[PDB]
Ligand binder design. Structure first.
Ligand SMILES: Cc1cc2nc3c(=O)[nH]c(=O)nc-3n(C[C@H](O)[C@H](O)[C@H](O)COP(=O)(O)O)c2cc1C
Ligand SMILES: Cc1cc2nc3c(=O)[nH]c(=O)nc-3n(C[C@H](O)[C@H](O)[C@H](O)COP(=O)(O)O)c2cc1C
Lengths: 352, 359
């Protein structure tokens, strides 16, 4: 049960296994004729080449051999085992080899809970925190793990930083970042603070019966109050006047842009661009307004302070009783977070 | 594998020990003459009797023998060892193989620990990933994210590592159409965490009077009618002079938000968004504010025409005619689900903090 024995004759290859050998392997003594192939069968496949070689060398050299290996069990886990081999030399020639397979299970020393905890914590102290960085990126841009992984690799190349170095830098960079900024824009600044290229700034320009249940007399006060209280920016420009000046700006516009409604009347809305308006973008807007068509524009803008943001503003033409388009309505929206995410997908697409 | 061998002639008791046997015991081959008495001197007293018997047994029987024992080390703890004895056939001599199991035993222990570390390293990576997912999904720091993972592990009676795996697998399988915070919240509840709260509130409004700027007063109705029509947020008007405060205006942004066409809601009170599930106290708060001509903001649970729910923060602004009579009310509905979902997670952490401070 603990150990078994066999003998092989060099000349005739006659293998005689003992009753104990079958028992150490998981057999009854008489069940099977014990053979070397059967012995190898109950060894872990990693042990079979060395075990065979150990025997062949004992036959060729006659010196004793010891092989460390496992013993497979049909149901249970493998047990540590050892095989010793010795030879009988007749006239400087090996006549037979006797082998002894022993079960080392009773000599195994198991790992204490303490040393395991020490080793696990040592590894946990030296780990790369990319898994956390992976989770932050996937959730921040609502992308999957693979996509989040791909982005982190790209960002490292641009920063010329180790992949793990990017993970730590991003995490402690995000932690010290300004919480008042939205997350996606916060993360992009963390990446640019580490040498990654700033995101692109290019934009684009693309193109009521009446219920009668409101008294005509009461409509102006109702509609005036509605524009005042609306949570999105509303503006009106007199396209008949010099330089298409603004004639209305609601409080939401002040909040969005930092310019007080009073101190903006009479001016063209270009001022939101500071002195950084792109010429090609201006031509698209100017051409749209002159043509009296309805259009939507994505553009970068700036508040009365330096704070930049993406602005998707829609332009609606309004006619008078004569059918002449005399005013335009502008609907400004801060769409920074959508654009930040969409730019990351552009980046992933570019990796095709 | 460090081992040594010997051969012992039966009749003459001649003992031939290998150079390797000398080294196993702790001597260069030339330093010592190898005799059976020398071998036993490096075994522990308690092994000597069993070892001698095994050697005598293999001689008489000729049957293989194995003896477990120690090897004594000068100024060091003994090493585990094992002797194998085979006879060369009567018994002409016995071949012995003394093996030092010190290395094999040490490596097996080291391997068990390595496998353990790999298991722990895997469980740490998933917790770290889930920690990061929570951090950015709800925009909270790592301690808060980790605290919420511990909280939701407690509420679902799960171990933190099992929760982490469930959240990652579940989120991956969630419906991509749901905005992330709603999506993740339903993953926690699908795993046994209790459902989020449903109770809202109603508060007053804490400005400057409205003006129409420099819009020509004649063009104002057309200009601002167009404005309310194209605005991206919902706008509704109710006539509080008519019975049951019916809806008299609703812009397309309201139609997108609720799934109701204006034609099919004009003339009805807005309560239909509550789907007959309005909290009695919340309704009374709204009624009282309206009856008093107050400006209030209300958070309430609502449902589109298709039944799907959303958190609605809608502001109520009274409109007074020339004589000062409130004739209409304006409502601005906003889907603030994602914000509310974050506030609720933050609310769970703040509730725990208060508990720790005051118990
Ligand atoms: C009602 C209205 C609102 C506008 N709002 C914005 C805006 O928010 N941001 C912006 O960059 N341009 C806006 N524009 C465009 C500018 O006012 C300007 O007409 C356009 O950029 C062309 O500028 P240019 O005359 O310098 O080429 C708006 C135009 C109108 C008519
Ligand atoms: C302009 C306006 C908009 C409203 N919008 C909503 C809404 O979107 N969701 C909601 O639950 N209640 C809304 N209400 C409140 C209900 O229509 C109703 O006044 C309230 O539930 C009163 O309680 P009762 O229905 O029990 O009388 C609104 C009220 C007004 C005047």
């Amino acid at each position: 049960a603990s150990f078994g024995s066999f003998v092989l004759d060099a000349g005739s290859a006659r293998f005689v296994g003992s009753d104990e050998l079958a028992l150490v392997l998981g057999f009854a003594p008489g069940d099977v004729v014990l053979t070397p192939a059967v012995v190898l069968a109950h060894l872990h496949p990693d042990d079979r080449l060395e075990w065979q070689a150990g025997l062949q060398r004992c036959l060729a050299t006659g010196r004793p051999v010891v092989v460390n290996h496992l013993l497979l069990t049909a149901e249970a886990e493998p047990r540590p085992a050892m095989t010793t081999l010795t030879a009988l030399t007749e006239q400087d020639r090996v006549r037979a080899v006797t082998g002894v397979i022993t079960d080392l299970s009773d000599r195994v020393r198991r790992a204490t809970e303490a040393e395991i905890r020490q080793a696990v914590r040592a590894a946990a102290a030296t780990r790369s925190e990319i898994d956390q960085a992976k989770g932050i990126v996937m959730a921040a841009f609502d992308v999957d793990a693979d996509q989040a992984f791909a982005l982190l690799k790209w960002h490292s190349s641009q920063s010329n930083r180790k992949l793990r170095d990017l993970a730590t830098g991003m995490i402690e960079g995000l932690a010290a970042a300004n919480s008042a900024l939205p997350l996606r824009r916060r993360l992009s600044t963390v990446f640019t603070d580490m040498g990654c290229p700033a995101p692109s700034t290019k934009g684009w320009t693309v193109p009521p019966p009446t219920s009668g249940l409101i008294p005509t007399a009461l409509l102006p006060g109702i509609l005036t109050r509605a524009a005042h209280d609306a949570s999105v920016a509303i503006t009106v420009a007199d396209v008949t006047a010099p330089d298409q000046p603004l004639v209305y700006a609601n409080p939401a516009f002040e909040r969005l842009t930092g310019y007080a409604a009073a101190e903006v009347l009479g001016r063209n809305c270009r001022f939101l661009q500071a002195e950084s308006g792109d010429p090609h973008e201006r031509s698209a807007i100017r051409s749209a307004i002159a043509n009296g068509d309805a259009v939507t524009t994505l553009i970068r803008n700036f508040r009365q302070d330096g704070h930049a943001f993406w602005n998707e503003f829609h332009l609606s033409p309004v006619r008078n009783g004569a059918g002449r388009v005399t005013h335009y309505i502008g609907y400004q929206l801060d769409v920074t977070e959508r654009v930040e995410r969409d730019q990351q997908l552009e980046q992933l697409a570019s990796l095709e």
